[PDB]
Write an enzyme that holds these catalytic residues in place. Structure first.
Site, mmCIF file in Angstrom:
data_model
loop_
_atom_site.group_PDB
_atom_site.id
_atom_site.type_symbol
_atom_site.label_atom_id
_atom_site.label_comp_id
_atom_site.label_asym_id
_atom_site.label_seq_id
_atom_site.Cartn_x
_atom_site.Cartn_y
_atom_site.Cartn_z
ATOM 1 C CG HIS A 100 -2.399 0.518 0.723
ATOM 2 N ND1 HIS A 100 -3.505 0.356 1.552
ATOM 3 C CD2 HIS A 100 -2.801 1.127 -0.420
ATOM 4 C CE1 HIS A 100 -4.529 0.857 0.888
ATOM 5 N NE2 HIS A 100 -4.156 1.324 -0.308
ATOM 6 C CG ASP A 123 -6.041 -0.407 4.876
ATOM 7 O OD1 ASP A 123 -5.809 -1.418 5.589
ATOM 8 O OD2 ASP A 123 -5.137 0.269 4.321
ATOM 9 C CG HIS A 125 -3.844 -1.534 9.134
ATOM 10 N ND1 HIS A 125 -4.123 -2.710 8.468
ATOM 11 C CD2 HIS A 125 -3.433 -1.820 10.386
ATOM 12 C CE1 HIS A 125 -3.865 -3.670 9.338
ATOM 13 N NE2 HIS A 125 -3.446 -3.180 10.503
ATOM 14 C CG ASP A 127 -2.308 2.072 5.379
ATOM 15 O OD1 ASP A 127 -2.247 1.389 6.416
ATOM 16 O OD2 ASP A 127 -2.543 1.591 4.246
ATOM 17 C CG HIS A 140 2.919 -1.623 4.553
ATOM 18 N ND1 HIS A 140 2.054 -2.697 4.557
ATOM 19 C CD2 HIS A 140 3.647 -1.644 5.693
ATOM 20 C CE1 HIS A 140 2.260 -3.321 5.705
ATOM 21 N NE2 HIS A 140 3.200 -2.708 6.429
ATOM 22 C CG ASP A 231 -4.819 -3.049 2.712
ATOM 23 O OD1 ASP A 231 -4.730 -4.296 2.478
ATOM 24 O OD2 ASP A 231 -4.123 -2.453 3.571
ATOM 25 C CG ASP A 233 -5.153 -5.068 5.486
ATOM 26 O OD1 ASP A 233 -6.103 -4.230 5.513
ATOM 27 O OD2 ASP A 233 -3.969 -4.775 5.790
ATOM 28 C CD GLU A 276 0.011 -4.187 1.852
ATOM 29 O OE1 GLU A 276 0.578 -5.254 2.158
ATOM 30 O OE2 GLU A 276 0.554 -3.078 2.012
HETATM 31 N N1 LIG Z 1 0.005 0.706 11.676
HETATM 32 C C1 LIG Z 1 0.898 -0.454 11.345
HETATM 33 C C2 LIG Z 1 2.272 0.119 10.915
HETATM 34 O O1 LIG Z 1 3.168 -0.558 10.431
HETATM 35 O O2 LIG Z 1 2.383 1.420 11.161
HETATM 36 C C3 LIG Z 1 1.091 -1.336 12.595
HETATM 37 C C4 LIG Z 1 0.873 -2.839 12.203
HETATM 38 C C5 LIG Z 1 2.059 -3.698 12.688
HETATM 39 C C6 LIG Z 1 1.748 -4.090 14.124
HETATM 40 N N2 LIG Z 1 0.288 -3.802 14.285
HETATM 41 C C7 LIG Z 1 -0.286 -3.570 12.899
HETATM 42 C C8 LIG Z 1 0.774 -2.797 10.664
HETATM 43 C C9 LIG Z 1 0.201 -1.418 10.316
HETATM 44 C C10 LIG Z 1 0.352 -0.971 8.858
HETATM 45 C C11 LIG Z 1 -0.642 -1.560 7.873
HETATM 46 C C12 LIG Z 1 -0.271 -1.233 6.429
HETATM 47 B B1 LIG Z 1 -1.347 -1.737 5.428
HETATM 48 O O3 LIG Z 1 -1.025 -1.374 4.070
HETATM 49 O O4 LIG Z 1 -1.491 -3.193 5.380
HETATM 50 O O5 LIG Z 1 -2.658 -1.094 5.610
HETATM 51 MN MN LIG Z 2 -3.166 -0.331 3.661
HETATM 52 MN MN LIG Z 3 -4.196 -2.783 5.826
#
Ligand SMILES: [NH3+][C@@]1(C(=O)O)C[C@]2(CC[NH2+]C2)C[C@@H]1CCC[B-](O)(O)O
Ligand SMILES: [Mn+2]
Ligand SMILES: [Mn+2]
Ligand SMILES: [NH3+][C@@]1(C(=O)O)C[C@]2(CC[NH2+]C2)C[C@@H]1CCC[B-](O)(O)O
Ligand SMILES: [NH3+][C@@]1(C(=O)O)C[C@]2(CC[NH2+]C2)C[C@@H]1CCC[B-](O)(O)O
Ligand SMILES: [Mn+2]
Ligand SMILES: [Mn+2]
Ligand SMILES: [Mn+2]
Ligand SMILES: [Mn+2]
Lengths: 319, 318, 319
Positions: A100, A123, A125, A127, A140, A231, A233, A276
């Protein structure tokens, strides 16, 4: 074909936004699943711009805890250029990810041709972590922070991101499917007053009210392009298990199809990210196939495939 | 027993409406699961009219691409006679399928005694393809076309179907659970203006609003008989996997029970079809048991079994 | 910490309220899963009052068909005393079960300090059978009948229950998730006019309307302490399979989290029961963990953990 079914496919085989290998195979598995063929079967004008090469950057030391900054920076800079090229050709840019972090490039490139665009972010998250609020250091989970105008002065000079100019305001983004947000991110989300529909809101209102409110919030004043950053997820891991950061209690297969069906109906989809999908993160070959099929189904709904059915403007009772 | 709890059970072991074997075992597996006994346990007056014998038609050549026309035609003709007999005896006809082509016979037989009936069609598919719009040639995906008055002149002379008279109008049917509709079928729905709640509508409104609108659309003018044609693939394959044409993103176990609980509450259920249960299509013996149990639960809810509970008209505290 | 996050934990390792062994290991598996640590991580003031010692009663003859009456009677008498002690110390009593017969002691002990309390009963079952209506003779399916003021004169002299005084009226309890109710129980429910949201109501209204109506029904007149008695079989067995009486078509992981999130938001949670977690009833080692993780997630939501995110009252963008 109609504007809402004219498509420019960009494969973005990139993984260095996160630490798990395999997400770069996302464009390969989505294509092998017959995405291009299935889109052409639903009266789409599909043009494949291929897979972006993303040449190696061997010397890419971290910016503080932020991993592979130049690699993530350059991949997003080239994606911007490619998305802008697709947009100038009067085509909806379909970015096949990839992690992402590529959203920095996808939204930036799209905003170069359509600065008035609105973002729908599906998502688990937010992000929205900045390079200073992040605890993981994985880019990401930081794309929204580089894109927001309100976060200018809070983003430090990260190597490979000097080309970045905040293109979206806090008022032009809507989140759907939230259930895993970091303290720093929750603070950003509340202080900036970003519109969001976490899983709590989806449970309270129902996906019908969620979509009705999402589309009225962004289109009520004036119709403008919609950029959907999806995303996988964001959906429950019972539908999309082959992903890096899965979280239980997610959006159902039906809710995912309902969001995309509603966005199609506006006729304003201008940019799409399918991110993702990591085929190395399945537990069984079936989990991988299940994730790819779900991602393909979400994509088809974005370009017209409706559950109620579809028909050509001809007399079916007298062919 | 109450009118809503007086049932006439008809076994319809028929599969030639489609190409997958095993759906003829549906009446056998539903009975073995103790359906008749469980219905009598919830104060139902149950009369079993047995399993209809479906005699072989060896030279049943296809009508164009339409497979086994005389076999499907005769099985329905037999079912129509039996449903009408059950209806004349003041009983709710309970058809245990068998493929959905048997709906031609079930609804026809029911309309002979109650012409003012309304149809609730729970399914992932519309089954409204005509012998000329069909691409598969499978009659289980064409029953509604033979039944609609508006499609008179659009149905060609199909062998084994000359007994058929369209008995329902486009305004008298409501679809619930749609998610896999053919172009020709979508054209028919839109041009005839048939009321439908596809999975999109179920997601938008919720099953509460779906049922409120379904029952008001049908009974709003005045009370009239209800025919529920329940195809188990209307429910998600995580509850009913042992079925011929499963489609993901279906009605939940809860939504299925909610639809049937609401229909029971009207006291106007007059005809019921439990179709497309195929015990040969379970990937594991558990997938078969799961489908049968779900189908049995749907059936019990149609005849009074409520999740909030049930009690006899006696004082339990004294 | 905040009143809504100031907690007093009571372990209740008791099983004789039902015939299946293992439910006494519930406090042990919930603690091992790191419940106390996870609560302290979300700014909770956690005090552990330990596990109540439930001494054996060897000569425990049944009262008619009612199994282990003195054992069930004494365990709840012991729990009542401990809950009252926790309540006097200005803490939310967190009872880790153990079978649902312990609710006799949990609600009784809570009502001694807060007599105006309202009960939210999350379960697939009503647990309102009297010692005379019960057909199983299992007291975990009878705690409500011992607690209701309207059922006084209908509860016979059961050995070990002479200490019991009905503390709640039929108008002070709300059921959520019901789907397996005995004829006698359904009669009690209707004749007493108890407020309930069976799975039929949850399907009709949605969990948003269910919660809005539940909280309005109890708190509309005046703010009052809320006692949430959560049986894990109230949730679907796809989330909580390791339980004694599982029933299909239950509340989702999301609905469970939504109920608890809404109760937290009132700031009126005063008593909590996490019951019927049986680690001996997990078909695989995976089924136990799923049930346990779900029960831990429900508990965290009761004390502040929100899906949209949480943040400390500090400026994250300017530390
Ligand atoms: N906010 C996260 C980060 O890496 O900042 C924390 C995470 C690691 C431990 N708990 C969940 C992952 C998350 C990022 C998600 C990125 B994605 O593209 O999948 O939305
Ligand atoms: Mn994402
Ligand atoms: Mn995500
Ligand atoms: N409309 C169909 C047909 O056979 O006409 C086409 C179908 C095959 C491949 N795509 C879906 C099946 C459908 C018929 C459904 C009959 B049933 O009783 O299961 O609803
Ligand atoms: N009403 C029951 C009882 O024992 O009273 C009957 C039951 C046994 C077989 N059919 C369901 C169990 C139910 C009580 C369940 C107690 B529990 O706290 O888990 O709700
Ligand atoms: Mn059908
Ligand atoms: Mn079907
Ligand atoms: Mn209980
Ligand atoms: Mn229970």
């Amino acid at each position: 074909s109609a504007k809402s079914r004219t498509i420019g496919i960009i494969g973005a085989p990139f993984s260095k936004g996160q630490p798990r290998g395999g997400v770069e195979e996302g464009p390969t598995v989505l294509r092998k699943a017959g995405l291009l063929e299935k889109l052409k079967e639903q009266e789409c004008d599909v043009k494949d711009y291929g897979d972006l090469p993303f040449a190696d950057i061997p010397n890419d030391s971290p910016f503080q805890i932020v991993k592979n900054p130049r690699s993530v920076g350059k991949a997003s800079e080239q994606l911007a250029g490619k998305v802008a090229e697709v947009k100038k050709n009067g085509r909806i840019s379909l970015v096949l990810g990839g992690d992402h972090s590529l959203a920095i490039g996808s939204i930036s490139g799209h905003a170069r041709v359509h600065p008035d665009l609105g973002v729908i972010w599906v998502d688990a998250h937010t992000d929205i972590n900045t390079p200073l609020t992040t605890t993981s250091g994985n880019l990401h989970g930081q794309p929204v922070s580089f894109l927001l105008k309100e976060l200018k002065g809070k983003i430090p000079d990260v190597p490979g991101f000097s080309w970045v100019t905040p293109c979206i305001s806090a008022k032009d983004i809507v989140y759907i499917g939230l259930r895993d947000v970091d303290p720093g991110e929750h603070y950003i989300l509340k202080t900036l007053g970003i519109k969001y529909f976490s899983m709590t809101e989806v449970d309270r209102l129902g996906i019908g009210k969620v979509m009705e409110e999402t589309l009225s919030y962004l289109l009520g004043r004036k119709k403008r392009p919609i950029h959907l950053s999806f995303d996988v997820d964001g959906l429950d891991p019972s539908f999309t298990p082959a992903t890096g950061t899965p979280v239980v209690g997610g959006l159902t297969y039906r809710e995912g199809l309902y969001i995309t069906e509603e966005i199609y109906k506006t006729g304003l989809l201008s940019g799409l990210d399918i991110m993702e999908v990591n085929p190395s993160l399945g537990k069984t070959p079936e989990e991988v196939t299940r994730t790819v099929n779900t991602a393909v189904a979400i994509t088809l709904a974005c370009f017209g495939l409706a559950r109620e059915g579809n028909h050509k403007p001809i007399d079916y009772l007298n062919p």
